[PDB]
Design a protein around this motif. Structure first.
Motif, PDB file in Angstrom:
ATOM      1  N   UNK A  76       0.736  -1.049  -0.033  1.00 51.59           N
ATOM      2  CA  UNK A  76      -0.084  -0.029  -0.041  1.00 51.59           C
ATOM      3  C   UNK A  76       0.856   1.253   0.062  1.00 51.59           C
ATOM      4  N   UNK A  77       0.206   2.688  -0.629  1.00 47.53           N
ATOM      5  CA  UNK A  77       1.073   3.717  -0.491  1.00 47.53           C
ATOM      6  C   UNK A  77       0.477   4.366   0.633  1.00 47.53           C
ATOM      7  N   UNK A  78       1.531   5.189   1.325  1.00 44.10           N
ATOM      8  CA  UNK A  78       1.178   6.029   2.408  1.00 44.10           C
ATOM      9  C   UNK A  78       1.277   7.261   2.091  1.00 44.10           C
ATOM     10  N   UNK A  79       0.231   8.455   2.255  1.00 38.11           N
ATOM     11  CA  UNK A  79      -0.004   9.844   1.833  1.00 38.11           C
ATOM     12  C   UNK A  79      -0.094  10.836   2.992  1.00 38.11           C
ATOM     13  N   UNK A 109      -3.815   6.070   4.106  1.00 37.68           N
ATOM     14  CA  UNK A 109      -3.506   5.039   2.972  1.00 37.68           C
ATOM     15  C   UNK A 109      -3.977   5.560   1.625  1.00 37.68           C
ATOM     16  N   UNK A 110      -3.270   5.393   0.637  1.00 39.11           N
ATOM     17  CA  UNK A 110      -3.441   5.787  -0.984  1.00 39.11           C
ATOM     18  C   UNK A 110      -3.568   4.318  -1.427  1.00 39.11           C
ATOM     19  N   UNK A 111      -3.316   4.205  -2.857  1.00 41.99           N
ATOM     20  CA  UNK A 111      -3.508   3.102  -3.443  1.00 41.99           C
ATOM     21  C   UNK A 111      -3.134   1.934  -2.748  1.00 41.99           C
ATOM     22  N   UNK A 165      -2.042  -2.321  -3.512  1.00 46.52           N
ATOM     23  CA  UNK A 165      -1.807  -3.003  -4.360  1.00 46.52           C
ATOM     24  C   UNK A 165      -2.589  -4.273  -4.499  1.00 46.52           C
ATOM     25  N   UNK A 203      -8.249   2.124   1.144  1.00 44.39           N
ATOM     26  CA  UNK A 203      -7.822   3.426   0.809  1.00 44.39           C
ATOM     27  C   UNK A 203      -8.566   4.422   1.698  1.00 44.39           C
TER      28      UNK A 203
END
Lengths: 90, 10
Positions: A18-21, A32-34, A36, A49
């Motif tokens: 996962x992506x962190x914003x 949490x962003x996108x 996977x 997300x």
């Protein structure tokens, strides 16, 4: 206004998935962003997300920085697992 | 960035 969840993930070879914003400006939440597809977070199924990240492995990150949370995730990666405490608006 | 590339991947 939130629900809180404590999520445990085993790391995969590709990470936690996962992506962190956020956490870039003072007071800006970390979230949490996108997520996977077929990654650890997706497979586990609990993370969403937009969830706000408030703790990593027992270290609070509320009011704290993008840099700190990434550092904590890098430490979690080394150990091969992570505990996330998140909040989502409900 | 488009939403799938935004943020730091972990």
């Amino acid at each position: 206004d939130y629900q809180e969840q404590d999520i445990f993930l085993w790391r995969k070879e590709t990470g936690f998935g996962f992506r962190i914003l956020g956490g870039n400006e003072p007071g800006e939440p970390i979230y949490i962003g996108h997520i996977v597809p077929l990654g650890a977070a997706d497979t586990d199924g609990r993370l969403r997300s937009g969830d706000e990240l408030i703790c990593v492995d027992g270290t609070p990150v509320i009011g704290k920085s993008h840099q700190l949370v990434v550092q904590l995730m890098q430490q979690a990666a080394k150990q091969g697992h992570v505990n996330l405490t998140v909040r989502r608006k409900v | 960035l488009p939403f799938e590339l935004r943020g730091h991947l972990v």
